[PDB]
Every structure is written in C-alpha cells, then in structure tokens.
Assembly symmetry: C5
Homo-oligomer: 287 residues x 5
C-alpha cells in the first residue's frame, strides 16, 4: 500500500479567525480569580527576568574590551536579541499573562462588550503589579545574589557590569516623546507576537515567528516595560550610574504610556473597526 | 496501543491549486468596502515602516566606523536583510494588504474576468494611497520623533545617520532604466513570497520561505516602493544629502513602474497563460 | 475537555513511495503542451537568474578588498551559498520545470516505459532551450541594464565586478574531466533536492532540505548548467576576462554532459533497479 | 479536484492540558521497576556526557590563543551553547529520565496525591544515582581515554585543556548563595524545556524550543547538576587546577540544592495552585 | 465558518514505539536480496563521499593562511560540520543503508530473534563492503579526477590540500584506545540520528535533529568509519603525508571496532533490556 496523495492539512488561519481568537483569548482573563491571575503575572515577570539575565550575560560576553574597540556594541546587542525571545515561549507554554500582551487582547474584548470596565481595570492592574513583583524578585534573588553583574573594576573582566551600565545609561537618557515613541514601536512587536501565537498553531510557528518579532525590537532599541523593570532595578542594585528618579520617571512611566498606547489605540482600534462584523457573525452563529 | 504507521498528511499544494488560491485571494480585495481596504493598507504601510526602522537600527549598529574600515558595508546589509522579513508576516497575519502583493493577485483576477476594470483601478489606488499614508505616518511619528537617526556629528556615534545617509544616497543615484530593472527584480521576490504564503500552509512554510525571499531582495539592492517611501522620507526628515526631487522623481516613480511591471506582466501574464484552463475547470466544477 | 493523546500524523514517506512519486512526477511532463512546457522552462530560468543576481550581490558585498585580505573568498562563497537556494522554491511553488530536475524524473519515467523516446527528447530539448532563454533574458534585462556588476575601476568600489570576474575565471579554467566531475557532483545534489520535495510534504521539509542541499553544492564549487548559463553570459556582458569560446566550450558543454550523466546514469539507473518491482506493484494494484 | 480550504489542525495545547500532561508524565516514573528506571537514568547521564564532550571540543576550538586575545571567551561560550542542546533530544527520544526534569513532574504528581512519599524518594534517588553513574562513566571511558583534553603545554595547541580549565575554575569559585541562585536559574530553563516537550507535539516544537531554552542557560553561566557532574570529574581526571573538595562541596551540593528548589518550589508549587482544579476536573471526567 | 479550536495532532512518538519501529526497521534489511542491499550500500557510500567532498571544500575555504593565523582551525571545522549532515538525509530519503546505522537496528532485531545469525553476518558484510566500494568510487571518480585537493605548493592557494593534509594527519595519530573511544563517541551520535529519523516523523524533525546530531560529532573529532574510508583514501590519492599502513591499521581498524561497539553493545543492549517486554506485547497483540 503506497500513499501517492496524502491528506491536505493546514496549521494557519485567516485574519478574521485570528481576531476572533484574540477577542476570545482576552475575554478569558477577566474570568480568572484574583490570586490565579496574580500568580500567572508573577510567573511571567519571573520568566522575563530569567531570560533577560541570560541575555545580559550573553551580551556582556561579546562586550569584551578588545572586541568592543573594533565592532563597538553591535555583536553585544545582536547576541542579546538572539538570546532574549525564549521568555515569550516560557510565558505562553505555562499559560502566564504579560501586561503588554494583555493591552491588545483584553482591550479588544473591552471594545466588543465582552469585558466590563471595572473588570478591565482590575485585570490590567493585577497583571502590571504581578509582573513588577516577579521581575524585581528575580532581579534580587537570582541576578543580584549571584554576583554576575558586580563592578570588578578591571577593564579585562568588567565587561558584564559595563554592558549593563551602558545599556541602562542609554535607555535612561531619552526625552519624554522619544521614550514614548520607542515604547510604541516595542509594543506593536509584542502584540504582533501574541497575534502570531494565536494564528500559527504549530511548533515552528510558535518558536520562530516570536523569535524574529522579539529579536526585532531587542535590536532596535525599543522599550519594553517589564524588561525595563528588570533591567533598571538590577542596574540600581549593582550601583551603575543611573539614579532612581532617572529609572522611574525618565524611563518607566513613558514606557508604560507608550506600551499602553500601542496596544489599545494604534493596534486594537483599527483591528476592531476592521473585524467587528466578523465577530458579530461568529456570535450570532452560536444560537 | 502502539502506532506503527501514522496518518499520512501534507501541508503543501500543486501549482494549479496555488494559481486558483491566488486568483481567489485577489478576487476578495475587490469586495471589501473602501474604508476597510484603506485601513488595511494603512496598517500594512505602518508594519513596513516598523520593521524598516528596526532594520535600519540593526544595520547601523554594524556600520560602526572601525568595523566599516575592515568589512565595508557587508555586515550592515546582511543584518538589515536578516531583520527586515518579519514585516510580511505582520502584514499577512493581520490580513492587511500591500500594493506589491496586490499587483500579482488582483491583476490575475482581472485577467480571469473576476474583477472589473474600475474596481481594479479603485483597489490599486486605495492600496497605494493607504500604504503611502501608513509609511510616512510611521516615519514621522516614531522614526523622526524618537531621534534615532539624528546627525550627531561625531564619527564614533554617527553610524545610524551615516548608514541611513549612505543607503539613501545609493538608491537615489540610479538612472531610470537601472531603477526600473532593480524594481522588477524586487517585485518578483515579493509576489513569489505572496505565492509562498498561498502554497505552504504551515508555520515554518510561512516564516522561512518569506524570510529567505525577502532577505534575498533586501541584500541584492532591489527596490521596493513602500520601503523606499519610508526610507527616503525619513532620510528627508533627518536632513541627509538627498533632495525631494531626487527622492520622488529619481527613485519613487521608476520603482513604482518596475514594481507594477514585475507583477502584472512578467509574472502574472505567463502564469495566467499556463493555468487559465485549470481555473476554468475549477469554476466549471462548482455548478 | 482536555486532549491528552492527540492524533498521530506523519508528513514523510518511504523510499518506495518516493520512487513512485518521482516516476509519476516525471510522467506528467510529457503530457503538457509544447508552449506550456516552454513557458514553465522560461520561468524557471528566470528564477535561477533572479536568485543568482541576488547571490552575486550578496557575495560581492563580502568580497570587499580589506576583508578579502584577511579571509580570502570564504565569506563571499558562504553568503552566496546562503542566498542562492530560494531559487528552487520559486521553481517548485509555481510549477516551473528545470532541466537538471528533469534529468532524474523524466529519465526514470522513460525507464519504466511511461514516456516514449521521442517524447523524452522533445521534453528535454524544450526544457533546456527554455531554461537558456529565461536565464539569458534575466542576465540582459535585469542584471546588465541595472549596472550592478559594472567595472568601476576603483578597488574600494569594484568588489562586485571583481567577485563576478574571479568566479567566472575560476569556473572556466578546468580541464574537460574536472568540469564533468564537478557537474556530476552538482546534479546529484540537485536531483536529491527534487527527491526531497517529493518526500517531505511540509513547509520546513520544503525549505530547509532544499536549502542545505543547494548550499552544499554552491559552496563546493560544483557546476550547475543553468546557473553557469546565467553567470558566464553576465560575465561576458560586463566584459570580464573570459571569452565566448572559454564560456561555451570550456565550461558549458562539460557541465551539460556531467549534469546529464549524474541524473540519468549515476542516480536514475540504480534507483530504477532497486524500486522497479514496487512500481510494478503500484501499477498492478490499480486494476 | 482542487483543495481550496484544507482541514484546520493544531499541534499545540493550552496551559491546563500541559499541566495534566506533566502530572501524568511524572506519575508514570513511579510505576517503572527499579532496574528499568536505573537503566534509563544511566542512559540519560551518558547522553549528557556525550554532548558536553562535543560542546567542550567545539568551544575549545574557538578558544584559540590568538582569537582569545580579541574576543575573549565570547565565541567559545556561544559555540558551546549552540552545540549542547541536542542532549535533551537524545534523552527524550529514547525515553530516558533526567533528575532535573523529574524535579518538576514527579513533584507535581506528588502534590496531586498520585505518587506516595516513599515512591517519590525512591524515584528521585535512583534517578540521581543513575545520572551520576552515566556521566562519570562517559567522562572516563570516552573523554579521558581519548586524550582530547590533555594538557599539551604549548599555548598554540592547549586551547581545549585551557577552555576546560577556565570553565571548571569559573564554576568552582562561587560562594554558596551565588551557586544556589545560578542553579535555580538553570533548572527553571530545564523544567520549562520539559514543559515545551509536553506542549509542542511536532518536530520543530521539539527541536527548537528545547534548543533556545538550553542555549539560554548554557550561555548564561547557569549551573546544571548533571553537566557539572560530567565537567568537574573530567576536569579532575585531566588534572586542572581544581580539587575534589572544590568540585564536590563548592559546586555540586549547592547546584543540587538550587536545582531541586527551582523545580519543586519555584515552578511546581505555583503551577499546582493554578491548575489543580483542572486536574480535578480531568480526573472526575474519567468515571 | 470560523475554526476556533482545530484538530489536535502529533508527529512524535514515545520510547516504546521508537524501539518497536527500530526493531521493525532492522528486520526489513534481512529480507532484501543481496544485489538490492549491495546497491543501496553503494549508494550510501557515494552520498557520504559526496557531502564529505563538499565539506572539505567548504572547510578549506576557511583554512586560508591569513585567517588560519588568527582563528586556527576553528572556522574550518565549524563550516565542515555545518556542511556535512545532508548526507544522512540523502541516505534516508532514497532508502539506502549505512553500516553504522545498521549496527543498532539489525543487532536489535538479532536480539529479539527476528534475524538469524547467518543473515546478520550476511547483511553486515554486504553493507560494509558496499559502503567501502561507494566511498572509494566517489573518492576516485569525482574527488581525485576534478583536481580539487591537488597540492599546488603556493601557500595562498594551497588551503584545500593543507586542510585535507592536516585533517588526515590529525586522525591518523591516535593510539588504538583513543581511536576506539572516539569511534564509540561517533557511533552513539549516528545511531541516535537513526533513532531521530524513526521518532520525529516530519520534515523539520528529519532535517534539524539529524543536522545537530551529525554536526556534533563532526566538530568533536569523533571517528566515523565511512567518512574515514573516503577521507583517508582521497588523502592517499592526492599524496598527503600519511601512508597506507597508517590509514588502514592506525585509523580504519579501530574505527570499525569502536563503531561496532557503540551500536551493538553500548546502545543496543541496554535499550533491548529496557523495551523487550514492550516488543513482546506488540507482537502478542498481532494474533
């Protein structure tokens, strides 16, 4: 028995089905309990801190002072962006929730009258607080207590502290509008990575679409709020040149504002206007 | 219970089914409303601008003045072509429409008498105008307002402005025939990437065929009209050496002409001549 | 409802089914009309010329005269072999026919008495002529008219012409037996890539098996007849050091002979001897 | 017959199904016999030693003394982390058991009252002892007896011994708390790789999620107990600078403690609290 | 009609099903005729010689004498290990048999009383003889007759002969025990690659698991018998420094012994002890 023509399959979907999957995905976050959503948010912040520690070590390896004289910071940022995107896979495969992914899906479910307003504010507040707690807890209990980014004062050995110092100094010197624009550019990639998870339902579609999307903002200098919550706090712990006013007012608040703008307004509102009749049809065809 | 021989499946199709899928894909664009097609075109131009900003930063990192003395512009163009092809995935997974993808599919549906002539002109005009608006809006609101490509006048720090300046000077110095030929070579790759999306219906077939096809024209110096609409306008915004006559007459019009020629004539007309009887059989077997 | 054990599937086949698929694939080429087969051959030659232009630009970028002093021609040939293999995906996904792929499949169908002798000669002649016409048409209308490989006489800028000149001089200096042996080594990889397309019926199996198989012959210095038809003609157009006698007698005829030998004799005849009883059963089980 | 819309499939699962699959996976380890579990543990330790020997040779190639002066140890650690993650695939595809993977799954089955306490201690003890025996047996019978890491005393040839010496000296100079923190960071990645195997049920989902997860801790300097059992014992065999007290007390005991903490407490207990009602529903729907 | 939850599939199997598939795979080799098995073995040796010629050229490109002064032999061995693993795909997709793959599967079928003893000796002898004939035939008719590894005596051009000379001198200087240990380490990877083909039944699972497994022994300096049969014979043909006693007694003999030991004893006997009751149940459930 020989098979000449096998069964034709497909592991992808259209734009209408991707919109309906995203609205149904954001609708489920409002039905968890408070402690369940809080534990998932703390786990997601911990995963972000884990892979950002790994990326900082991998980028400070290529920030060696003799290699830095020839290539600058190019290979450091490339190996950082290569090492980082597994955090999103760790978040998705355990079912954890990130705030920047929720800014598209839960807001889309708010637009479609699937989530109430107080439930929306409750979900977003609990998700942001849990992501902060998880990222700062990983920055203290693993990153600070292992001594990986300690200032060791010798230029042939200090290339991990110096990479953390220069990265934390670069992202704390923007003006308000520049940090808001870079955060908008970040969260468009992050929400599109969530959309890729909802669309391409196989292993390579999970791994490599999210890999290219997260590498693309990690190498562009775009500003993610949870990765900055990890990075600026570990940079404050190991005593880099930044201060706490520079960390929280000059980076974290414009990053939060731009990340919310890119998910709720730039991406969610045109896609709602495009596919709201398809969501209306899907729902009517359930009676 | 042990499975010795599983069920034989297949996530690919033949050339006849790919042609029928492309004609049916281009036939659907003439049935959207004007505002729906306009919003999808604006979103596609925004995605092109997003990943071209990311690619310009990733290429200007490797354009550091000490690395540039050894390797020239080789690693800059390679990392640009590595970072760019996720834009096409962002366009496909949200259901947005690009003009260069439409030049094959909607013209094929025009040849098969599925789209009328005024509907064809309406769809192409709305798609080109929306792609222009989205790309220039991203070039101003994110790329210009973040200060990423500002001339900072110091050779150890000016490697983002200098990469943008040299790229925008290289693609503005062609003659008419050279720019038309490079645009033809670009849009053959872009229309083949659309054909790859219609053929390989899984996650790796979406990601990596489009990756190799878009990297191949990004490293070849081929001319894409929407990427040039982004790049020459951000190069005019940050005050590179090019002028607006050089940007619009010496690059953009021959790129539009060559991109339309490669989709409507070079690729669409032989494929129509090859597979029009298979499309006739597909239609005849629906009565 | 939770899925603990999903449905076991398989997107691969055995050697007997791959042989039967290859004989049935080569049997279909003798049933097209002459103009249909001619148009598919012209499209395949055009795709080969397209991705060879892209690979020549990508390899001449890394052939910069300061990088060439350190690494030689290693990174140029690696980036050429990285950029090239998407040509075969273009050929496969549109349904075009290449001569070197046909030398295995149509000859296997000739051995199994599925194609007559005059139909075999007609199919091979039309395929070779159309591939030549498509490759020389792309070499003139895109590669020559864009000025990408023009001798610009300055050593810091002439690294595209110099890469084309040195590649075209390297592959024109072989003796007859050396060029025949390198062509045999090429067409074994090309016919195995066709066999990979017939065996692995998913997107990653299409992309990456063909990628590794075509990169392996592009970095080995093996001789492909259609890629040489493009390369030696564009090298004659931009006035490199080779002549037309060296291009056509010293390279193209031994490449044609070795490419036919590797498909019809080295690969097709042992596989026919191995799997002809399976093809006999497959045919006997259709009555 | 043309297929326009194929059958929609999916090779991924949700978080609840991944939890149920992990509890059912850890429940099966307590039902093997003692010799079966011991043989699987010895095979897993042998695979870890195999791919760590391969990674040590691949990293000592890039630790050449003229390349080490420019890039430091960056390319050595990158090629180590590139070469290493196939060990886990070798462990999964043969059905072998690793201790660090078991610390999540068997502890989750202990929390759900599926494994008794003495069965838990028996499974963990037999798994750790077999992994130790397999790793030290590969370190002697292949790594030591082949002479690959012999001190050859000449700086142009000693780059395998020097890479092993510097890696074994770096991971033996930590304090207790630093080694515990790095081991926690390691076993979060290892348990998430086990979770990726249970979630993404296709070939790319097996290969590349595990690749990125294991590369991410191999480049971060995180501490795996079985890889350290191989590495410190082969470093003691070829007479590096470390001692047996430094190997066993200063590295191996804090690595065991942190690896158990990250699987049983950091990852297993929140996921149990999140998904224990879904496991209760899965069991209630089997009567 | 929108698909919200598609059909859950799986392209992987467990360890018991992989063992049963391996025993049934090795049991089929004893049922071929002598000429069929001989032709498949000759084809497998030819494929090994093909991709080893390609890997030798790709590694001698990066062995350029100015690059060799900085990085040593690191990039040469990396590009060799990158280029090599497509040989295994060429062997699998045509249905050819390699001796090193057979040492696990046919010995497992011997342990399960599925193959008799004389049939076992006949299959192993015919497979080894055909692999030798195919590898030496490719080493003469393609590798030697093309002049690719000729000593050209100029240090700026002799980097293919010098890479072949130094590789053939490195692998001929081991002691008996060192070559046996390196051959054991090789054939564990080769038999695990065969196991990966039997387990992961999709295109990425075929390509990339075999890629990483074969790259891992190609960069580790592990000794494969068929690749050494090619390499030492082409090194004797182009007159390197080795002799025929060094080639056949000091390398080939211990490589054959270690490759048989790693398949029949190290890997086959524990896996037989683990899964023989599952094979008994699989057979008992066929009556």
């Amino acid at each position: 028995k020989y098979v000449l023509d096998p069964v034709s399959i497909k592991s992808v979907c259209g734009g209408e089905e991707s919109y309906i999957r995203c609205v149904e995905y954001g609708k489920k976050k409002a039905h968890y309990s408070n402690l369940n959503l809080l534990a998932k948010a703390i786990l997601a912040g911990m995963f972000v801190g884990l892979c950002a520690h790994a990326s900082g070590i991998a980028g400070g390896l290529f920030y060696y002072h003799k290699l830095r004289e020839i290539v600058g910071a190019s290979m450091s940022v490339f190996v950082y962006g290569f090492t980082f995107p597994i955090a999103f896979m760790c978040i998705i495969c355990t079912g954890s929730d990130l705030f920047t992914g929720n800014t598209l899906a839960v807001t889309m479910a708010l637009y479609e009258k699937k989530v109430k307003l107080l439930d929306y504010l409750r979900v977003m507040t609990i998700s942001l607080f849990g992501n902060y707690v998880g990222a700062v807890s990983f920055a203290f209990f693993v990153s600070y207590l292992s001594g990986a980014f300690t200032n060791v004062h010798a230029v042939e050995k200090n290339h991990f502290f110096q990479f953390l110092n220069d990265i934390a100094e670069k992202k704390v010197h923007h003006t308000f509008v520049e940090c808001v624009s870079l955060a908008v550019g970040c969260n468009i990639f992050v929400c599109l990575a969530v959309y890729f998870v909802l669309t391409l339902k196989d292993g390579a579609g999970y791994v490599f679409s999210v890999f290219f999307a997260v590498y693309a903002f990690a190498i562009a200098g775009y500003e993610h709020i949870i990765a900055n919550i990890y990075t600026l706090n570990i940079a404050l712990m190991v005593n880099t040149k930044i201060t706490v006013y520079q960390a929280y007012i000059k980076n974290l608040l414009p990053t939060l504002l731009g990340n919310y703008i890119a998910g709720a307004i730039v991406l969610g509102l045109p896609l709602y206007f495009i596919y709201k009749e398809h969501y209306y049809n899907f729902e009517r065809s359930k009676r």
